[PDB]
């Protein structure tokens, strides 16, 4: 079932990979943590409603590029937090509706204790999300790939 993003450019039914540009907080002191609100960014909807109850999962969520050495925490799926990068398949959620339901995922990142200057570069790669599609009619499993880029510079204030 086809998804979308804030830019409106995403992948069609069956799978694929896309790029999603998100805006972050320029400064977050160690402690107070910035919510990567993908919930306002990514959206998806059951293209085939009624008799086929859609099942959508976050199989793989990995953090590399900038975040692997920078702002990096857990991942909140429908309230339930899980360690990030995703070491296991998350508990399932369902959509089964003709409405671009918000992706109930937020990246509760956390700056490292050894953070320095501009830890996240504008345009650097922060996180990647893999989406699992299962339904109630066939054994078709499709992966949907999102590549999050922060178009902005995140630097934690640093003192001594």
């Amino acid at each position, epitope marked *: 079932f086809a998804c979308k993003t804030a830019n409106g450019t995403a992948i069609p039914i069956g799978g694929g990979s896309a790029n999603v*540009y998100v*805006n972050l*907080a*320029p*400064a977050v*002191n*160690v*402690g*107070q943590n910035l919510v990567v609100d993908l919930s306002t960014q990514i959206f998806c909807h059951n293209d085939y409603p009624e008799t086929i109850t859609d099942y959508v999962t976050l199989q793989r969520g990995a953090a590399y590029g900038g975040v692997l050495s920078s702002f990096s925490g857990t991942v909140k799926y429908n309230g339930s937090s899980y360690p990030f990068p995703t070491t296991s398949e998350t508990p399932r959620v369902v959509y089964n509706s003709r409405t671009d339901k918000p992706w109930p995922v937020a990246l509760y990142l956390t700056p490292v204790s050894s953070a320095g*200057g*501009v830890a996240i*570069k*504008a*345009g650097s790669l922060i996180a990647v999300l893999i989406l699992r599609q299962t339904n109630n009619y066939n054994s078709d499993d499709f992966q949907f790939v999102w590549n999050i880029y922060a*178009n*902005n*510079d995140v*630097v*934690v*204030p*640093t*003192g001594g």
Partner: antibody
Framework: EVQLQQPGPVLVKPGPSVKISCKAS????????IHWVKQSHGKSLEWIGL????????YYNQQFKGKATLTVDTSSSTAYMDLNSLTSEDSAVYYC????????????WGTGTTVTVSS | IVLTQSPALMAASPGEKVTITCSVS???????LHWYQQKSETSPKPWIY???NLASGVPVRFSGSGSGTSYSLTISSMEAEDAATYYC?????????FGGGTKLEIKR
């Protein structure tokens, strides 16, 4: 109401510094980042740096990487801009400003000092 | 070159639409450059927080619009008052770089 204050004319010989203040009140402070801006007469207002009254953590850009010692006293909610080195050329108006946590931008600027270098 | 602006001075008769352009070295991140005014010997008052985003306490005639590589500001109507020098600040990379700015006078 919910604003910020700072001292007046701080005319001085080139010396070590001016070490001016930036007094804040009204809003729930020591929870919002604050930055600083230098305006040298009718020139660019090129931003200097930023200090965090939650933790200080202050850092500045490579241009004014030599004359900035921004800190804050939390109890009175008063930042301090201290020039590590003398200006002796940069007779510029210095502005305290703060950064809102929503749409991130500089808002509620300080009144501003007037730094003058003559002997 | 991380930011630049042109020209150094507009002008505006009352009731005249004014446009100012701020061009940047590379396409930035879309919708995050801020526009401030500074009157002479006065504290700067922010007007724009990213594209098409009025700041805290702006009129509606004042506005903005643009794209990811060259942004701009539009003041639809003029009543003097706002005669100040306006600067584009990029919330893209560190060091943040205020532009050259345009000392905007009033045209007669």
């Amino acid at each position: 109401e919910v604003q910020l204050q700072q001292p007046g004319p701080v005319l001085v010989k080139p010396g070590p510094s001016v070490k001016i203040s930036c007094k804040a009140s009204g809003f729930t402070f020591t929870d919002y980042f604050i930055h600083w801006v230098k305006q040298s007469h009718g020139k660019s207002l090129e931003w200097i740096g930023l200090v965090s009254p939650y933790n200080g953590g202050t850092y500045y850009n490579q241009q004014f990487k030599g004359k900035a010692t921004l800190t804050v006293d939390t109890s009175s909610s008063t930042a301090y801009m201290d020039l590590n080195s003398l200006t002796s050329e940069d007779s510029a108006v210095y502005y305290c400003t703060r950064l809102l946590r929503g749409y991130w931008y500089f808002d509620v600027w300080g009144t501003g000092t007037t730094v003058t270098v003559s002997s | 070159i991380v930011l630049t602006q042109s020209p150094a001075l507009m002008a505006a008769s009352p009731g005249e639409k004014v446009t100012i352009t701020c061009s940047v070295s590379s396409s930035i991140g879309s919708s995050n450059l801020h526009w401030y005014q500074q009157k002479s010997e006065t504290s700067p008052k922010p007007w724009i927080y990213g594209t098409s985003n009025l700041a805290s306490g702006v009129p509606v005639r004042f506005s903005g619009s643009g794209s990811g590589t060259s942004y701009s500001l539009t003041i639809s109507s003029m009543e003097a008052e706002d005669a100040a020098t306006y600067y584009c600040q990029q919330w893209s990379t560190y060091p943040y770089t205020f532009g050259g700015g345009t000392k905007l006078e009033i045209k007669r």
